[PDB]
Amino acid sequence: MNIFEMLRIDEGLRLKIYKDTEGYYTIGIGHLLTKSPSLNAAKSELDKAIGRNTNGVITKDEAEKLFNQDVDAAVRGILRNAKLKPVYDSLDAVRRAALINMVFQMGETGVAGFTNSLRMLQQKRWDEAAVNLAKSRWYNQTPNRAKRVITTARTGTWDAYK
Numbered sequence: 001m002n003i004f005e006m007l008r009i010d011e012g013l014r015l016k017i018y019k020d021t022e023g024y025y026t027i028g029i030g031h032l033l034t035k036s037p038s039l040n041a042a043k044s045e046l047d048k049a050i051g052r053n054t055n056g057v058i059t060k061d062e063a064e065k066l067f068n069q070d071v072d073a074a075v076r077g078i079l080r081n082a083k084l085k086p087v088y089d090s091l092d093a094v095r096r097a098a099l100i101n102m103v104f105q106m107g108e109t110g111v112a113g114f115t116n117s118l119r120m121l122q123q124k125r126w127d128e129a130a131v132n133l134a135k136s137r138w139y140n141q142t143p144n145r146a147k148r149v150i151t152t153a154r155t156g157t158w159d160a161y162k
């Protein structure tokens with residue numbers, strides 16, 4: 001199992017614009033198109049992102065192309081971030097995938113804000129980190145996905161995804 005397969009499980013694949021959990025216009029593999037209520041602003045962004053006139057529909061390849069760009073941006077966002085970087089450098093490869101999942105989902109800023117949890121992740125205090133991570137809107141809004149990511153972080157194994 002790897003970050004890509006982990007995220008494709010968590011986000012699904014949709015070839016047609018849809019709304020996310022939060023209500024935002026999304027497409028492919030968790031690719032947020034806009035937070036604007038307009039489906040027309042969504043089609044615009046979508047067309048921009050893809051380089052073509054899509055009419056709200058994309059091919060599998062296109063969805064994969066977007067996903068590759070997003071995981072990449074996610075990793076680079078982590079390594080460019082003064083709050084995130086140290087935590088990541090300190091982690092083994094499984095737990096790293098966990099932080100990457102979070103950043104893909106909630107943006108760098110979002111995660112960078114989990115101050116306390118990042119600190120316990122750094123100090124390798126797994127259980128406590130797991131408990132603190134659960135005290136978040138994130139966990140309350142998307143409990144099953146969050147529980148999965150959180151267990152990956154606590155344990156350093158891919159069990160929750162098996």
Ligand SMILES: [Cl-]
Pocket residue numbers: 049
């Ligand atoms: Cl884009």
Ligand SMILES: [Cl-]
Pocket residue numbers: 141142143144145146
């Ligand atoms: Cl969920």
